[PDB]
Ligand binder design. Structure first.
Ligand SMILES: [NH3+]CCCOc1cc(-c2cn[nH]c2)ccc1C(=O)Nc1ccccc1
Length: 316
């Protein structure tokens, strides 16, 4: 169509891996850097507050375990979101293939979850829809959080904290959500499951769940700290980070602080953008710091990705 005309100035489109709604996702290729991206194609004409809440949160959140927003491109009929390439699939699909994971393996995965959410909370937000479908793997087998549709709001019931279902919410509901996630990783089934919703709300409030035989007392203890019906009783992120289970095969707490900065500009990247946009530093160093999430924001971030993979820093 004529909607893809501003898109095709910057991206060489590829295979669709999204068939169902505006949740439709085409693979893409950045023309300048040569780096692989994923394009979410939303049409406004067809829930668009979930698109607006997402974009706003992603513009302000920047983290090694959060799926990066590079470019927002808004024609008359359509909203395009250009996001990081996660070829490794859903953590959901990873679990249901493997038939549950070992404590050693779940920790490797779970420490990346703690890292992302601890930063989300440090930035004033709460995700409100944490589930293994909303955590994807990049090509280096490292996790990236998605779907900021709800933010600082009911997501999926199986993962919803009791106080949230009651209408008594803000970041404690995420700690419970991570406690449901920790169980499914180690068991390969939900701690609270039924046929009807009124039956599933009944099982959450009461809070009694099964403890499979193969679970360690270290796991059993952390699960009961995270799966408390009282959110005041629920373990704090400050105590989660340096928990002894979190530590078990790592002698150091979860590194939660962002290695991906907003203020700091890479010198190799600011200079390579100059020799192509026909300008100088100071004029470019402030132009990148605009963070408009236009073509310049996509080109900078993907160059900063290109440098990190070991390849030489160049645009075409
Ligand atoms: N609606 C879910 C589509 C899954 O694709 C993505 C969605 C988001 C997303 C949606 N909302 N927020 C982030 C971010 C990245 C991807 C992605 O890179 N997927 C992928 C690419 C290549 C191969 C396999 C998977």
């Amino acid at each position: 169509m004529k909607d893809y005309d501003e898109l095709l100035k910057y991206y060489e489109l590829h295979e669709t891996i999204g068939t169902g709604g505006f949740a439709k996702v085409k693979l893409a290729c950045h023309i300048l850097t040569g780096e692989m991206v994923a394009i979410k194609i939303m049409d406004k004409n067809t829930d668009l507050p979930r698109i607006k809440t997402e974009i706003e949160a992603l513009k302000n959140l920047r983290h090694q375990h959060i799926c990066q927003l590079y470019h927002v491109l808004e024609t008359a009929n359509k909203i395009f979101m250009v996001l990081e390439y996660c070829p490794g699939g859903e953590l959901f699909d990873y679990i249901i293939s493997q038939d549950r994971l070992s404590e050693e393996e779940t920790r490797v995965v779970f420490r990346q979850i703690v890292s992302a959410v601890a930063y989300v909370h440090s930035q004033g937000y709460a995700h409100r829809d944490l589930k293994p479908e909303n955590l994807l793997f990049d090509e280096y087998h490292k996790l990236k959080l998605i779907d900021f549709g709800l933010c600082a709001c009911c997501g999926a019931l199986a993962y919803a904290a009791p106080e949230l279902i009651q209408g008594k919410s803000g970041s404690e509901a995420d700690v419970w959500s991570m406690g449901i996630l920790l169980y499914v990783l180690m068991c390969g089934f939900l701690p609270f499951d039924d046929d009807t919703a009124a039956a599933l709300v009944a099982k959450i409030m009461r809070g009694k769940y099964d403890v499979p035989k193969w679970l360690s007392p270290s796991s059993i203890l952390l699960l009961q700290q995270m799966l408390q019906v009282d959110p005041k009783k629920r373990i704090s992120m400050k105590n989660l980070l340096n928990h002894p289970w979190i530590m078990q095969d790592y002698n150091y707490p979860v590194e939660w602080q962002s290695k991906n900065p907003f203020i700091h500009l890479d010198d190799d990247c600011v200079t390579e953008l100059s020799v192509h946009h026909r300008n100088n530093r100071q004029t470019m160093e402030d132009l990148i710091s605009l963070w408009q999430y236009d073509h310049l924001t996509a080109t900078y971030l993907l160059l900063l990705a290109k440098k990190a993979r070991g390849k030489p820093v160049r645009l075409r």
